[PDB]
Amino acid sequence: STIEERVKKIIGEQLGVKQEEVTNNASFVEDLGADSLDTVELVMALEEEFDTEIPDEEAEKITTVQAAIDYINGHQ
Ligand SMILES: [Zn+2]
Ligand SMILES: [Zn+2]
What we know:
Oligomer: monomer
CATH class: Mainly Alpha
CATH architecture: Orthogonal Bundle
Shape: globular
Keywords: acyl carrier protein, acyl chain binding, fatty acid biosynthesis, lipid transport
PDB class: lipid transport
CATH topology: Non-ribosomal Peptide Synthetase Peptidyl Carrier Protein, Chain A
Entry title: crystal structure of butyryl-ACP from E.coli
Name: acyl carrier protein
Bound molecules: zinc ion
Number of strands: 0
Assembly: monomeric
């Protein structure tokens, strides 16, 4: 599996949407129906999945599937 698939699976699990809905362009709030706690636990999920802390200022930009992928990739 790849980081990309791992990220999409997590967003899927966390936002309760089927995998096909987790497109690279998809916006968590606008497109995937996320509310505040959803975006907070998603980032929390990504930190545990990849065993790494995500600083708040970087986390705030993780608003789309692609942004989540780019952050994790950029951090190894
Ligand atoms: Zn990859
Ligand atoms: Zn949209």
